[PDB]
Design an enzyme around this catalytic site. Sequence first.
Site, PDB file in Angstrom:
ATOM      1  CE1 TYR A  45       0.009   2.216   4.023  1.00  0.00           C
ATOM      2  CE2 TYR A  45       1.039  -0.219   4.409  1.00  0.00           C
ATOM      3  CZ  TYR A  45       0.822   0.915   4.895  1.00  0.00           C
ATOM      4  OH  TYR A  45       1.614   1.325   6.025  1.00  0.00           O
ATOM      5  CG  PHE A  55       3.459   9.597   0.563  1.00  0.00           C
ATOM      6  CD1 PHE A  55       2.894   9.365  -0.224  1.00  0.00           C
ATOM      7  CD2 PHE A  55       4.630   8.258   0.663  1.00  0.00           C
ATOM      8  CE1 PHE A  55       2.069   8.328  -1.552  1.00  0.00           C
ATOM      9  CE2 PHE A  55       4.838   7.267  -0.239  1.00  0.00           C
ATOM     10  CZ  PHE A  55       3.351   7.544  -1.126  1.00  0.00           C
ATOM     11  CG  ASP A  56       2.634   4.507   6.485  1.00  0.00           C
ATOM     12  OD1 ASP A  56       3.921   4.709   6.836  1.00  0.00           O
ATOM     13  OD2 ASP A  56       1.343   4.003   6.449  1.00  0.00           O
ATOM     14  CB  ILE A  75      -8.882   3.246   9.767  1.00  0.00           C
ATOM     15  CG1 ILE A  75      -7.925   2.871   8.445  1.00  0.00           C
ATOM     16  CG2 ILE A  75      -7.765   3.648  10.808  1.00  0.00           C
ATOM     17  CD1 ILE A  75      -8.029   4.088   8.011  1.00  0.00           C
ATOM     18  CG  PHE A 118      -4.771   4.054   2.804  1.00  0.00           C
ATOM     19  CD1 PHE A 118      -3.714   3.691   2.947  1.00  0.00           C
ATOM     20  CD2 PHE A 118      -5.897   4.600   2.843  1.00  0.00           C
ATOM     21  CE1 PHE A 118      -4.100   4.101   4.412  1.00  0.00           C
ATOM     22  CE2 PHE A 118      -6.090   5.333   4.306  1.00  0.00           C
ATOM     23  CZ  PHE A 118      -4.904   4.756   4.853  1.00  0.00           C
TER      24      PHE A 118
HETATM   25  C1  LIG Z   1      -8.701  -0.091  14.784  1.00  0.00           C
HETATM   26  O1  LIG Z   1      -9.009   1.664  14.719  1.00  0.00           O
HETATM   27  C2  LIG Z   1      -8.097   0.806  14.139  1.00  0.00           C
HETATM   28  C3  LIG Z   1      -6.995   0.389  13.877  1.00  0.00           C
HETATM   29  C4  LIG Z   1      -5.579   0.475  14.091  1.00  0.00           C
HETATM   30  C5  LIG Z   1      -4.646   1.655  14.458  1.00  0.00           C
HETATM   31  C6  LIG Z   1      -3.544   1.297  14.463  1.00  0.00           C
HETATM   32  C7  LIG Z   1      -2.896   2.760  13.041  1.00  0.00           C
HETATM   33  C8  LIG Z   1      -3.453   1.380  12.000  1.00  0.00           C
HETATM   34  O2  LIG Z   1      -3.229   1.698  10.334  1.00  0.00           O
HETATM   35  C9  LIG Z   1      -4.513   2.440   9.285  1.00  0.00           C
HETATM   36  O3  LIG Z   1      -4.713   1.099  10.072  1.00  0.00           O
HETATM   37  C10 LIG Z   1      -3.909   2.563   8.081  1.00  0.00           C
HETATM   38  C11 LIG Z   1      -4.280   1.142   6.917  1.00  0.00           C
HETATM   39  C12 LIG Z   1      -3.463   0.249   7.466  1.00  0.00           C
HETATM   40  C13 LIG Z   1      -2.270   0.962   6.736  1.00  0.00           C
HETATM   41  C14 LIG Z   1      -1.464   2.211   7.589  1.00  0.00           C
HETATM   42  N1  LIG Z   1      -3.073   3.427   8.509  1.00  0.00           N
HETATM   43  C15 LIG Z   1      -2.209   4.459   8.135  1.00  0.00           C
HETATM   44  O4  LIG Z   1      -3.509   5.144   8.566  1.00  0.00           O
HETATM   45  C16 LIG Z   1      -1.251   4.847   8.467  1.00  0.00           C
HETATM   46  C17 LIG Z   1      -0.276   5.124   9.712  1.00  0.00           C
HETATM   47  C18 LIG Z   1       0.670   3.908   9.370  1.00  0.00           C
HETATM   48  C19 LIG Z   1       1.088   3.641  10.859  1.00  0.00           C
HETATM   49  O5  LIG Z   1       2.787   3.280  10.415  1.00  0.00           O
HETATM   50  C20 LIG Z   1       3.142   3.266   9.345  1.00  0.00           C
HETATM   51  C21 LIG Z   1       1.347   5.075  12.226  1.00  0.00           C
HETATM   52  O6  LIG Z   1       1.757   4.164  13.038  1.00  0.00           O
HETATM   53  C22 LIG Z   1       1.605   2.929  14.033  1.00  0.00           C
HETATM   54  C23 LIG Z   1       0.355   5.074  12.068  1.00  0.00           C
HETATM   55  O7  LIG Z   1      -0.684   5.484  12.869  1.00  0.00           O
HETATM   56  C24 LIG Z   1      -1.764   6.330  13.134  1.00  0.00           C
HETATM   57  C25 LIG Z   1      -0.891   5.582  10.405  1.00  0.00           C
HETATM   58  C26 LIG Z   1      -1.438   6.583   7.922  1.00  0.00           C
HETATM   59  C27 LIG Z   1      -1.538   6.959   6.380  1.00  0.00           C
HETATM   60  C28 LIG Z   1      -1.745   8.292   6.028  1.00  0.00           C
HETATM   61  C29 LIG Z   1      -0.435   8.633   5.929  1.00  0.00           C
HETATM   62  C30 LIG Z   1       0.178   8.394   7.302  1.00  0.00           C
HETATM   63  C31 LIG Z   1       0.111   7.530   7.914  1.00  0.00           C
HETATM   64  C32 LIG Z   1      -1.857   0.710  11.858  1.00  0.00           C
HETATM   65  C33 LIG Z   1      -0.259   0.931  11.733  1.00  0.00           C
HETATM   66  C34 LIG Z   1       0.269   0.235  11.821  1.00  0.00           C
HETATM   67  C35 LIG Z   1       0.049  -1.127  12.085  1.00  0.00           C
HETATM   68  C36 LIG Z   1      -0.571  -1.616  12.255  1.00  0.00           C
HETATM   69  O8  LIG Z   1      -1.046  -2.800  12.209  1.00  0.00           O
HETATM   70  C37 LIG Z   1      -0.235  -3.964  11.914  1.00  0.00           C
HETATM   71  C38 LIG Z   1      -0.006  -5.659  12.204  1.00  0.00           C
HETATM   72  N2  LIG Z   1      -1.393  -5.739  13.226  1.00  0.00           N
HETATM   73  C39 LIG Z   1      -0.622  -5.562  14.225  1.00  0.00           C
HETATM   74  C40 LIG Z   1      -0.781  -5.442  16.066  1.00  0.00           C
HETATM   75  O9  LIG Z   1      -1.414  -7.020  16.049  1.00  0.00           O
HETATM   76  C41 LIG Z   1      -2.304  -6.918  15.198  1.00  0.00           C
HETATM   77  C42 LIG Z   1      -1.469  -7.352  13.858  1.00  0.00           C
HETATM   78  C43 LIG Z   1      -1.601  -1.022  12.058  1.00  0.00           C
HETATM   79  C44 LIG Z   1      -5.336   2.579  14.357  1.00  0.00           C
HETATM   80  C45 LIG Z   1      -6.831   2.458  14.434  1.00  0.00           C
HETATM   81  O10 LIG Z   1      -8.089   3.473  14.558  1.00  0.00           O
HETATM   82  C46 LIG Z   1      -7.544   4.429  16.170  1.00  0.00           C
END
Ligand SMILES: COc1ccc(CC[C@@H](OC(=O)[C@@H]2CCCCN2C(=O)[C@H](c2cc(OC)c(OC)c(OC)c2)[C@@H]2C=CCCC2)c2cccc(OCCN3CCOCC3)c2)cc1OC
Length: 128
Positions: A45, A55-56, A75, A118
């Site tokens: 992604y 950007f990520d 999310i 995304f």
């Molecule tokens: C149920 O609601 C949520 C669930 C989870 C989260 C955390 C953020 C989530 O990231 C995301 O869900 C999305 C989609 C997947 C790719 C990353 N995502 C992001 O938003 C990115 C992202 C990357 C991140 O790191 C690479 C983040 O730091 C943890 C992050 O934190 C908010 C957000 C942002 C997208 C646009 C530009 C900036 C970054 C995420 C980020 C990194 C790893 C993730 O999961 C790893 C796998 N897990 C590990 C734990 O055991 C279960 C499996 C999930 C927030 C939630 O709401 C508070």
Amino acid sequence: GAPATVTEQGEDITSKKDRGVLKIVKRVGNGEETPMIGDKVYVHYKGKLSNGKKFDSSHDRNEPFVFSLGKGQVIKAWDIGVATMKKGEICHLLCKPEYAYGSAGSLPKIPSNATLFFEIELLDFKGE
Ligand SMILES: COc1ccc(CC[C@@H](OC(=O)[C@@H]2CCCCN2C(=O)[C@H](c2cc(OC)c(OC)c(OC)c2)[C@@H]2C=CCCC2)c2cccc(OCCN3CCOCC3)c2)cc1OC
């Protein structure tokens, strides 16, 4: 650009039809199956805020991004969107804050009230 195109052309894949998660297929996938709740999914992604500059990408960190579908590990827009994809598919998703980080946000990366964009490539998926 790509986010405005999603606004204009994207399919609303929300249950409520509130235009909270809009999708465009950019590359058609293979086969017929789409992943089930609880499947381990494998993606590449890229993501960004629609406003400002953050950007990520999975591509940096040197491997597919893995999570269990439909279990709140990502999310809501991802749980909804990835469930619609076939293996090999690439889509663009526009995600309103109600399906992302809402009014709270998640700093530094994510402000309050942020719309996210995304590109997701579904590589594989397997029943837990
Ligand atoms: C149920 O609601 C949520 C669930 C989870 C989260 C955390 C953020 C989530 O990231 C995301 O869900 C999305 C989609 C997947 C790719 C990353 N995502 C992001 O938003 C990115 C992202 C990357 C991140 O790191 C690479 C983040 O730091 C943890 C992050 O934190 C908010 C957000 C942002 C997208 C646009 C530009 C900036 C970054 C995420 C980020 C990194 C790893 C993730 O999961 C790893 C796998 N897990 C590990 C734990 O055991 C279960 C499996 C999930 C927030 C939630 O709401 C508070």
